[PDB]
Design a protein around this nucleic acid. Structure first.
Lengths: 99, 216, 185, 10, 105, 230
RNA sequence: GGGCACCACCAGGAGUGGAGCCUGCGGGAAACUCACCAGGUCCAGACACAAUAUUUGUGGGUGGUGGUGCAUGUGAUGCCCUUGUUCUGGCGCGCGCUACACUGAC
């Protein structure tokens, strides 16, 4: 659900495959349904993360880097959410200050 | 036939060795400013040590000169010095394959300011005033071979071009430098492979692909 | 030219405040359900717009007419469409970004069917969605890394001096031994 | 690291 | 359909780093200084699974064995648990005297 | 329809020496290349064409032959080439004298001729050269013959001028799967293409026009990269 | 014409030569000739507003005690380049043995 090689195009192939790529790029439709309560039946394996694309286009520096970490190649596996937890406006301002 | 700037119609390939490091010095006669021949003198002159390398120019020159499309007579070489000196290189000369005679040829070019044959019918190496557009033909497309641009298969690109729209390919022959030098001249930037290549192998790849699209 | 989700949430909340006077949109958490706008709008172009003339509105807002709420509504409409054409058309999540906003303004049209700036907001919304392509992402693609390369190698003084002295000692002792052997024989 | 650059020097 | 779990890579213990997937014997060898029998005896002294991984051995038993390695003699432990000019003169003398020997002979 | 690969760290391709005798790859040899040693007397040196000619003459051989410039330039473009980034070829130098040289595909050839020559004489007397990190011997002089060093499933051709011409893209698409290729190039100044005609099968040409060994190597490299989509 | 040979053919096998020990057998980074190289010391020291008896508080000028062809020294010349004072030092040959092979080690 993050990137699809059927939609990435290859320079090393035929007019046939380029035409077919264009046809499927036109005929694609996201089949995700959100009002569904059946979690196995929301077809969420067939979607992308446009939300994370915008999170890449965030405004703030710290959040922008924390989405470019999603864009960068998948290195590690540990992040210690117990550390990533305690944050809000007050602590954020403290850290930043120190017509 | 012989292709000159006095021809300005048909399909051809024109290469640009942009900001190629070529400096000379006066020791008592002249010596090329080769890096490894003397670095302390460069330390005195303040020009940085790893920036003046004319052997890379030699390698690119040998590659373009012995490419098969040169035997097809369909290219010509324009050198842009970092100090404002255009040099035209004709398609029918045998530049030396030895660095000693090559560097001597550079210093005598740099203080004779022209090179004609002793055959004396046409020139071999010319020193003409920049800009380059004075000799660049009419239907000319100017493309930088840059690493950051999206890559394109050479056969598709050469055939995607028209018939008489001739092609000029820009390569900065330096070791290192920021690649936004050619923008006030070039149409567009194209990549060629996923890897940091060399100037010589990039020019060879391009003339090989053009060879394939014109079936030499 | 960046993006703010808090702004899109602001739009959600404030427009539901002007509709509530709930079941279609229970994902919202409104605040003061009352102060809506009943069906008495005259919606002429002579109505009060933004009038960015501040404290005369701010410290005296509480005595609400229909007119000041209509004004702040149309301020919201202008702000929305301005940042629409500034950022939200360009953003890649445009589609499900503007899904519930399209819901909101279509609800305004089904309520009144009278405004024309919301109506043209809906029209340009349809134009932008029919226009844009909405392909899935291709975030994870990397150029192949090359091989690690290296560099070639080519061209303790007291220890090496001890070495050379030891070689000289060995050579000299063996040589003198040969000489003594020969002369004695 | 090294990519069409040259060598080190002593 | 849910089951919950009760893993840490290369550790930094006493000025050097040690790997994280292999059994505690090989771990206590790659810790700088000490030996196999020492390892097996101190691990059965702290009563830790011999077979467990270095990805295993969580923080409490880790710091316990750190206490033991930092102060072993408090745990009934034995001591095997811790860890030119004349050349010039002789050369010059022999070469000189053999020179004179050649000359007299 | 089919899952993506589990890990997506773009890893380095597996580096290759001759000890792998299984993997399908490419190998280029430089035949009859002139790399000769001499001891001037207080310094050893590599024989060079231009500067020392009467001392070549007093030795008695041909200055028309003793020239390592083409070897150096061909080596430079080959070990610079993008297939050498993809890690799919290695270099064998078969000297004019007879020594086998395996050149690892991770070395960085010295760009200037003087540094290149100094390396070459150190190699030709020392037999092995280590990196700047000093755990891997990048240059390996090794034992004749070369086919007793090549991988098993190979085709062996020479690159000659008189041969009929083909398209190397056509040739590499004509190959089989595990069948590697082995192209012999003639890095001579001026000589007959009769060096390995008992070793290899057939002669091949890339144009009806004479080339250099360098641009022939570039032509073969780019036919390779187009045939293998790299 | 015939016969022969690990000083030949053919098939292979094993050695010498890399490294260490050794009985034994022979025997010219930099500088056309009071330069460079390398070291360190002199300086890289206009003015405008306010005020003390030249310096301070506040604004700011910067390329030529330049090379330079060429034509009659005439050229607000075209390019290039600037970014000097001071003492010091420059063995070869050679047989044996030992290392280095999950062709394992305990």
């Amino acid at each position: 659900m993050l990137h699809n090689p059927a939609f990435i195009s290859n320079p090393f192939q035929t007019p046939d495959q380029v035409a077919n790529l264009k046809t499927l790029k036109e005929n694609y439709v996201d089949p995700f349904d959100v009002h569904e309560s059946d979690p196995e039946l929301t077809h969420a394996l067939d979607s992308s993360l446009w939300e994370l694309a915008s999170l890449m286009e965030h405004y703030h520096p710290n959040v922008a880097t924390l989405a470019k970490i999603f864009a960068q190649p998948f290195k590690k596996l540990s992040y210690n959410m117990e550390d990533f937890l305690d944050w809000n406006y007050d602590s954020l301002l403290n850290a930043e200050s120190s017509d | 036939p012989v292709l000159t700037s006095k021809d300005k119609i048909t399909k051809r390939m024109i290469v640009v060795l942009a900001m190629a490091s070529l400096e000379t010095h006066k020791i008592d006669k002249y010596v090329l400013l080769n890096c490894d021949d003397h670095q302390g003198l460069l330390k005195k002159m303040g020009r940085d040590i790893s920036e003046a390398r004319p052997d890379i120019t030699h390698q690119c020159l040998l590659t373009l000169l012995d490419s098969p499309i040169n035997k097809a007579g369909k290219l010509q070489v324009y050198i842009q010095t970092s100090r404002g000196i255009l040099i035209e290189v004709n398609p029918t000369v045998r530049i030396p394959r030895t660095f000693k005679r090559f560097s001597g040829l550079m210093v005598q070019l740099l203080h004779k300011l022209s090179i004609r044959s002793v055959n004396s019918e046409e020139k071999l190496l010319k020193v003409i005033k920049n800009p380059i557009t004075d000799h660049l033909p009419t239907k000319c497309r100017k493309v930088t071979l840059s690493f950051d641009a999206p890559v394109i298969r050479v056969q598709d690109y050469i055939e995607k071009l028209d018939d008489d729209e001739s092609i000029c390919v820009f390569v900065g022959a330096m070791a290192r430098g920021k690649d936004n030098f050619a923008d006030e001249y070039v149409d567009e930037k194209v990549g060629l492979s996923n890897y940091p290549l060399s100037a010589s192998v990039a020019c060879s790849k391009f003339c090989h692909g053009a060879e394939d699209a014109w079936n030499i | 030219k960046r993006y703010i989700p808090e702004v899109v949430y602001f739009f959600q909340k404030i427009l539901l405040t002007f509709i509530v006077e709930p079941l279609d949109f229970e994902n919202i958490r409104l605040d003061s359900y009352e102060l809506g706008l009943p069906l008495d709008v005259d919606f002429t172009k002579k109505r009060s717009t933004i009038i960015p003339l501040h404290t005369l509105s701010t410290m005296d807002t509480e005595a609400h007419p229909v007119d000041q709420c209509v004004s702040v509504l149309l301020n919201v409409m202008e702000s929305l469409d301005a940042t629409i054409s500034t950022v939200w058309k360009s953003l890649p999540a445009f589609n499900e970004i503007i899904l519930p906003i399209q819901q909101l303004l279509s609800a305004y049209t089904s309520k009144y069917s009278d405004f024309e700036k919301p109506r043209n907001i809906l029209n340009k919304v349809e134009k932008l969605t029919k226009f844009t392509e909405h392909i899935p992402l291709a975030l994870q693609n990397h150029k192949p890394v090359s091989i690690p390369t290296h560099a070639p190698k080519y061209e303790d003084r007291t220890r090496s001096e001890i070495n050379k002295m030891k070689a000289q000692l060995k050579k000299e002792r063996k040589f003198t031994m040969k000489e003594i052997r020969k002369d004695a024989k | 690291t090294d990519r069409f650059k040259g060598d080190d020097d002593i | 359909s849910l089951v919950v779990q009760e893993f840490q890579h290369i550790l930094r213990l006493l000025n050097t780093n040690v790997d994280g997937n292999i059994k505690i014997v090989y771990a206590l060898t790659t810790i700088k200084g000490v030996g196999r029998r020492y390892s097996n005896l101190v691990c059965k002294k702290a009563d830790v699974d011999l077979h467990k991984r270095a990805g295993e051995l969580t923080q409490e038993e880790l710091e316990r064995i750190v206490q033991i390695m930092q102060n072993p003699t408090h745990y009934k432990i034995p001591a095997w648990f811790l860890n030119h000019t004349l050349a010039n003169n002789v050369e010059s003398k022999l070469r000189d005297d053999l020179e004179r020997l050649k000359k007299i002979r």
